[PDB]
Structure 1
Amino acid sequence: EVKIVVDRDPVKTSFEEWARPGHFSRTLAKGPDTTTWIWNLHADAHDFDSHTGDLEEISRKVFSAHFGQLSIIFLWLSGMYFHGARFSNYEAWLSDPTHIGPSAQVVWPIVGQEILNGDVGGGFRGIQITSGFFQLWRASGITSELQLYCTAIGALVFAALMLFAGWFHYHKAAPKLAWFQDVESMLNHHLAGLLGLGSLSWAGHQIHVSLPINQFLDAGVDPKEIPLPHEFILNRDLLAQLYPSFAEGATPFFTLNWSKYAEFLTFRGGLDPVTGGLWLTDIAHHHLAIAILFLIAGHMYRTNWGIGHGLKDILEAHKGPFTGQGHKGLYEILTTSWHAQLSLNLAMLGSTTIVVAHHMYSMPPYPYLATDYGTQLSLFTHHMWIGGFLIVGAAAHAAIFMVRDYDPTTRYNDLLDRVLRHRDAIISHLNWVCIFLGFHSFGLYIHNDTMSALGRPQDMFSDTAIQLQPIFAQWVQNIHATAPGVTAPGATTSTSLTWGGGELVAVGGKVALLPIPLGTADFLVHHIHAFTIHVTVLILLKGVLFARSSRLIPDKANLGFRFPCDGPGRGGTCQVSAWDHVFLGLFWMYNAISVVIFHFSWKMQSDVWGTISDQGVVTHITGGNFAQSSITINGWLRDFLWAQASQVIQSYGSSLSAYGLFFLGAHFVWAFSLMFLFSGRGYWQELIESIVWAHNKLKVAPATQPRALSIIQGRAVGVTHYLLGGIATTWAFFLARIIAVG
């Protein structure tokens, strides 16, 4: 069956190699005859599958690499907790979080950057932050710098431990194949073990530490004399004072009359007006139910005993009439090629990151989070960016799998075979859908702008003119606002407040959430999003499906994954490798994310965020001009892009001045990218040649023969600089604007 088989001490911890670069690649280890060697060295370091031919060694290598990654993550967490401990105003922030700006970074007074340590309130000076740690540290009842300090220490310990574990598992006790390739027990554990018990232990930490101290702070007390956590579990009488049921030990649970615990485990829903956040009772019930669900899920597959399924015994049964034999053998494909798994997991992880970004703003989990505007905004846009990048990586590695490790002779399948057998139909129909959406979602904006600039407003696309109504969205919102009436009696309000029914939650003269109406502008922006997503999918899916062989080049696969072209023959064959398909799709994903985040910023600052008067009149941060100025590109310039770019541009000579400076460098690089994206190579090669002559004239010609970057590396550096410029520009814009006005 399945056992603990491993091997002993393959590679010794000897520095013999560190002084010899490129030991892994036979060609690289010979020596740098030119300068392209030092590019090619970094370029293929992590390329494990091109260093061997057996999956055992590359599996060991990736097992060690995961430990390296985890060590870096732990070190980052430790740095964060430290800087919170020794360099923040966290205690003053806890004193009253309504109007005290979270700052967690000071700068040394050397070169005039003292102005960076701007006024943040609470007798502190420091660069304001928007990471949003403080809402978490108030949720977990840290409420003391000693806790941050010791947590940073423990994080450092875990980091060193993981680094050790890595070194040991690669060098000394290397796992074997029948361990890795055994996915049944891995699924079994990770379902039951990691996620379930994780959520369970967190529910523990919440019901036994957070809930009481948070309730006390909501009652209003200086956290100095707030009783320490362990003094809430050792002596029961405190929790007894809080929750009568909680003073009944464990009888009401075991004896199946769970309703007694109804006080601290409940299903209220909505938000908590004391902090706008979620009712921690609800989130505790959530984490606990999720723990139980993962535990009961974990027991699916047979591992050693006689019960349970087998991932081979599940696929082959499914075989429909149209497709034929079904998923037979697919189990072998997804167990014999790492790149396949990397692609699948990257896709699912990007999608989950996006849905996390979405669910965050509309249901603020933490307390006093939906009122620190910049934090909410920055979190949402960061998660969106991460999701986009993960998705593109998924597509790229899927293409790499399609090229290298796919083969019908032994890694056969009858499903993917059919899929590839009609690729042309797929790409054609997706292309036509892309054209259709492009037309009927952007030409609408063009028509609206034109009919505006021609003095014919009553022929526009808006509520006051020829009208388009997003009826399905309002239908769903009505349903979600009337569902807690009959369908979900156990709830108290709608699942969130953004559903089109209820009241508004406002703390400290500022609003946090309220109903959200949808106008024709929302219809148009949603169709823009749909179109751009469809085009990115078109690019990447075409790349994957045509990575093997196209009707232009018959044997593309033999030429490898990443090569620049196939010469200028047959009318020119530039950018045919799947690698170049990903190079293209990157820009379109960037554009999709950019327009999405702009739409989000405008919609929030024009319909939700803002301040509330003493009487109750709302005056939003931007005045609520969305439904009347999002329908013209010229509007986007005037109402949003130009106007709300003030705070970044007057930012010189103030605390926010750093956000100003980047706003130029971001643009600059942004420029710079074109120089690599537009030019070619031969020109630069000849220029380098003349420069080498000019040097050689002075007996300075270096033996590391200069060489203009190879084509693929040129495109890579170009796209990297371009993404950097764009993202840094929107980053500076967002931070400066929101943290200045809000």
Structure 2
Amino acid sequence: PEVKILVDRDPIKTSFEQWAKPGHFSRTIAKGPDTTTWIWNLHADAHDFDSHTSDLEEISRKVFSAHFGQLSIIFLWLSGMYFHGARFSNYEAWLNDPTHIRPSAQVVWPIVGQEILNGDVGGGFRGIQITSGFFQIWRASGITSELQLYCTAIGALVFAALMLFAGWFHYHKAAPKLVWFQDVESMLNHHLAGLLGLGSLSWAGHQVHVSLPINQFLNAGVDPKEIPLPHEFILNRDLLAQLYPSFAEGATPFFTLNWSKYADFLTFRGGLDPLTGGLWLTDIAHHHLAIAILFLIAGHMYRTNWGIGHGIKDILEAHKGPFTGQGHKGLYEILTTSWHAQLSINLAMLGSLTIIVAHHMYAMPPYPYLATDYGTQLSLFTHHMWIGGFLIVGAAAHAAIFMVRDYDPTTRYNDLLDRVLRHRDAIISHLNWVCIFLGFHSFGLYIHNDTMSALGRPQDMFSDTAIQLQPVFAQWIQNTHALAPGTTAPGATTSTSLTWGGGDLVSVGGKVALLPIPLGTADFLVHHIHAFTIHVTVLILLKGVLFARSSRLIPDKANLGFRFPCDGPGRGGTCQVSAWDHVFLGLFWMYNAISVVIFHFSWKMQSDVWGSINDQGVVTHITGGNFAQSSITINGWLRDFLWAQASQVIQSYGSSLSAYGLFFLGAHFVWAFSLMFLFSGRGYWQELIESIVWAHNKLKVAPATQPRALSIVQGRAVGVTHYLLGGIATTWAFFLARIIAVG
């Protein structure tokens, strides 16, 4: 009943015995290989711990230490970033003059003439211009020298070592047992209050003492080397009292509850800093303070050892009504015995979170000199969109794996899951209809516009000047937001963003940081295209999950396992009738959706927001509002967006952006290459490998591990992975080359 640390001593002895043996976990693998297919299986089931065994304890111990290994990898990556910024960067030069020097923290060796990639990024430096936005983070944290970056790199190196050691320790020396993992009340209490609460309180503590004064000094124009070191701001306090007078009272305001005496550096201004083009740091500090208080209270909800708190089982089984029978009764037993349920929930939430992060970061730029660094903005948005999409697809993959492997109504019965399984056909039919209707009335409008324009009938077109489809709801909402500060958020001075409205354009160094974003008919059309693509990928994934165990087609689909080729060409043909195959499609449709989203973002930003400001306040954008009139027909996307924007990357050869041109072409190649795997089947290939094997045998050079063509599932996997790599990489090259050349 009570909660304690519970461990096991030396469960597995560290040794090199199993390294010598390839696929020790799989009994069939351990023995050895007869054909080439054995090598592929070895890799495909390396991390599927729940099939190497059946013990939940062993699965969870393996999971814990694998997480430790992953954390170590992440720390090594971070330390590499910091070290490259310390040693092979122009960070100090950029710190002296941010809006003329281009950030770059990677140089290349002059081996085969590749030193042309060491382009002129300014600052007496020649390297590869980076888009990671790391310089902005380091500037917002207060880092002024490269000694601080060196110290950070070494600290992260020793942290990576610590994480690797802890991974070894918690698997080979002191491995917890099942009752320790199956405690989720204390785990939640610690992750809410300890990891997020204390973490954000600690970060607010950093910003209050390091980033606020140092960034004040930097924005006052002081030479970066003439700025006091951060620890001075802690030793000598009147240094802070000068910048921030109310540091004089010194924490007595915090206990007199005269918190208003802190109004100096704990603000609620909102908007952007007109000097840096980022959010006010005195706003971010206040934000993290409030976040910390909220999380610290929130991590006290669940009962662990002292009576007070909430039993999650009680909360769950208290919720049920007349439509759902006994809903939520039995979910606590499901979410604590199967790792795949937890994994899919967390993956869905993390993907949602990543995409929300992308949006909020484009809209409210948090770092100084980030908004006017167009390359960094574009790259960050695109990268986070892709990450979010991939995570969301993985959520569906693991929900299906749960349904196939761990769902059991004999021992772990839940009502809601059962009801959804019982009317899955109604669910999928209505989602099908919605997909069809949405596809007709969003893309059909584009086709109508294209033919109306090609028949010389622009008046009949669905445009801003012929037949207006105005997004009146979005316009109304954003006008409500523009009017918010002072009316219904009285403590704010500026609206939370500048895309809402109110005028108040902000520029930095002759470039536009932000201005109100207008929503017209093209925005309506493309938003409905977005809704359509999201609905279709949801349809595919949900159909895969709901029909993973059985269907009216094949009545015992679970016995065939979560992943399998087919069940023969019977009943008309059952190609890809498995849950894994549904995930394979969803990835295709996720690719489509995210591609359209990032294209929309890039065109709209290069057309209505970014650009150069001038002396009168005349804003010339990258494209003179060509999105409002040209984006309404597909010919406009092919001509004004792809063909026009594509010219930058094509002319990259012979300059320092040549690598982007090379990657453009190479990604085209690998994408086209995927089609060989996606259009063919393994029968032809086995029959061809047969005669190649004959040719080898004729010369006593045939191998003993018999070469087999790939499995049916592996061929689809090779085809989908190559497809995604090709498409994403060509978009990456195009975006980067274009925004670095025109930005």
In structure 1, the residue matched to 2:189 is 188
1-structure distance, mates of 2:518, 2:728? 30
Could you give the per-residue CA deviations for residues 235-255 of structure 1, whole angstroms, max 9, x where no partner exists?
111111122211112211101
| 8 Å CA contact 2:660, 2:737 repeated in 1 | yes
Deviation at 1:483, TM superposition (A): 1.2
1:182-203 deviation per Cα after TM superposition (whole angstroms, max 9, x unaligned): 1110001111111010000100
- Could you say which residue in structure 1 is the equivalent of 2:151? 150
- Give the C-alpha shift of residue 2 in structure 1: 1.3
Deviations 1:101-154 (A, max 9, x none): 001110001100111101111110001111100011000111100000010000
Please state how far the C-alpha of 1:502 moved relative to its aligned partner: 2.8
Distance 1:106 1:58 in 2: 43
Deviation at 1:4, TM superposition (A): 1.4
What whole-Å deviation, never above 9, does each CA across 1:406-425 have from its counterpart, x for those lacking one?
01011111111111110000
User: Which string of whole-angstrom CA distances, capped at 9 and with x for unpartnered residues, describes residues 392-412 of structure 1?
Assistant: 000000000000110101111
Per the TM alignment, residue 322 of structure 1 is displaced from its structure 2 partner at its CA by: 1.1
CA distance in 2, matches of 1:694, 1:418: 59
Measured after TM superposition, the shift of residue 163 of structure 1 is 0.4
Q: Deviations over 1:270-317 (max 9, x none)?
A: 111011101100000000000000001111111010111100111111
Cα distance in 2, alignment partners of residues 378 and 466 from structure 1: 35
SS of the residue corresponding to residue 17 of structure 1 reads helix
Is 2:330 the partner of 1:339?
A: no
1:495 is paired with a residue of what secondary structure? Answer: coil
Instruction: State the shift of 1:380 in Å.
Output: 0.3
Which piece of structure 1 moves more, 383-392 or 5-14?
5-14
Partner SS state of residue 559, structure 1: coil
Superposition deviation, residue 469 in structure 1: 0.8
Cα displacement (A) at 1:497: 0.8
The residue number in structure 1 matching 2:477 is 476
- Further displaced range: 339-348 or 476-485: 476-485
TM-aligned CA deviation for residue 34 of structure 1: 0.8
Separation of aligned partners in 1, 2:139 and 2:245: 25
Instruction: Answer yes or no: is the 8 Å Cα contact 2:273–2:280 preserved in 1.
Output: yes
In structure 1, the partner of 2:286 is 285
Q: CA deviation at 1:487?
A: 1.0
Contact 2:378–2:602, Cα closer than 8 Å, also in 1: yes
What per-residue deviation string (whole Å, max 9, x for no partner) do you get for residues 501-524 of structure 1? 231000111111000110100000
The 3-state SS of whatever aligns with 2:122 is coil
Match of 1:252 in 2: 253
Contact 2:537–2:586 (Cα < 8 Å) also in 1: yes
Superimposed CA distance per residue, residues 404-454 of structure 1 (whole angstroms, 9 cap, x where no aligned partner): 110101111111111111000000000000000000000100000001000
How far did 1:616 drift? 1.0
Task: Name the counterpart of 2:549.
Answer: 548
Q: Indicate the SS of the match to 1:104.
A: coil
1:673 aligns with 2:674: yes
Q: Distance in 1 between matches of 2:451 and 2:647?
A: 27
* 8 Å CA contact 2:355, 2:388 repeated in 1: yes
C-alpha separation in 2, matches of 1:637 and 1:21 = 50
5 Å-filtered alignment, 1:96-495, equals 96-495=97-496
In structure 2, the residue matched to 1:588 is: 589
Q: What's the CA shift for 1:551?
A: 0.5
- Which deviations, in whole Å up to 9, do the C-alpha atoms of 1:343-383 show, x marking residues without a partner? 00000000000000000010000000000000000000000
Structure 2: runs of 5 or more not aligned? none
Contact 2:216/2:243 (<8 A) preserved: no
Alpha-carbon distance, 1:268 to partner: 0.5
Q: CA separation in 1, counterparts of 2:243 and 2:90? A: 30
Please state how far the C-alpha of 1:500 moved relative to its aligned partner: 2.4
Per-residue deviation, residues 58-112 of structure 1 (Å, max 9, x unmatched): 0000000000000000000000000000110111000010111001110001100
Alignment partners' CA distance in 2, 1:235 and 1:682: 77
CA contact (8 A) 2:522 2:631 kept: yes
- Point out the more displaced range, 575-584 or 236-245: 236-245
Name the CA distance, whole Å, in 1 between partners of 2:416 and 2:742. 55
TM-score, normalised relative to structure 1? 1.00
CA distance in 2, matches of 1:370, 1:87: 25
Residues 421 and 546, structure 2, Cα contact 8 Å, conserved in 1: yes
Asked if structure 1 preserves the Cα contact closer than 8 Å seen for 2:671 and 2:726, the reply is yes
Q: CA RMSD in A?
A: 0.7
1:554-613 Cα shifts (integer Å, max 9, x gaps): 000011110000100111110100000011111000000000000000000000000011
Matched residues in 1 for 2:501 and 2:522: separation?
A: 17
Gaps spanning 5+ residues in structure 1: where? Answer: none
1:688-730 deviation digits (Å, cap 9, x = unpaired): 0111111101111111111111100000000000000000000
- The whole-number CA distance in structure 1 between the counterparts of 2:339 and 2:459 is 59
Q: Distance in 2 between matches of 1:209 and 1:700?
A: 68
SS across alignment from 1:398: helix
Instruction: Map Cα deviations across residues 47-67 of structure 1 (whole Å, 9 max, x no partner).
Output: 100011110000000000000
In the alignment, the residues of structure 1 paired with residue 331 and residue 238 of structure 2 have an alpha-carbon distance, to the nearest angstrom, of 59
Could you tell me how far 1:485 is from its partner in structure 2? 2.4
The residue matched to 1:224 in structure 2 has which SS? helix
Q: Using the aligned pairs only, state the percent identity.
A: 96
Aligned length: 742
For the residue of structure 1 that corresponds to 2:348, the secondary structure is helix
CA distance in 2, matches of 1:561, 1:58: 18
Q: Which stretch of the first structure deviates more once superposed, 238-247 or 391-400?
A: 238-247
Describe the SS at the equivalent of 1:174.
Answer: strand
Question: Normalising by structure 2, what TM-score?
Answer: 0.99
C-alpha deviation, 1:615, in angstroms: 1.5
The alignment partner of 2:576 has SS state of coil
How many Å separate the matches in 1 of 2:414 and 2:616? 68
Looking at structure 2, the residues matched to 295 and 485 of structure 1 have their Cα atoms a distance apart, in angstroms, of: 30
Rounded Cα–Cα distance in structure 2 between residues aligned with 1:190 and 1:707: 48
Query: Aligned with 2:723: secondary structure?
Result: helix
Q: Which residue of 2 aligns with 1:699?
A: 700
3-state DSSP of counterpart to 2:418: helix
Distance in 2 between residues matched to 1:36 and 1:156, nearest whole Å: 39
Q: Supply the distance in 1 between the matched residues of 2:276 and 2:127 (Cα, whole angstroms).
A: 25
CA distance in 1, matches of 2:326, 2:225: 69
Q: Which residue of 2 aligns with 1:519?
A: 520
Deviates more, 1:66-75 or 1:502-511: 502-511
* In structure 2, distance between residues paired with 1:731 and 1:252: 51
Local SS of the residue matching 2:513: strand
Q: Deviations over 1:514-548 (max 9, x none)?
A: 00110100000000000000000000000000001
In structure 1, C-alpha distance between the alignment counterparts of 2:45 and 2:275, rounded to whole Å: 55
Q: Is the 8 A contact 2:649 2:737 kept in 1?
A: yes
What secondary structure sits across from 2:549 in the alignment? coil
Separation in 1, partners of 2:222, 2:656: 32
In structure 1, distance between residues paired with 2:93 and 2:403: 56
Moved over 3 A (4+): none
The equivalent of 1:534 in structure 2 is 535
SS for the counterpart of 1:380 is: helix
For the 8 Å contact 2:512–2:609, the answer to whether it is kept is: yes
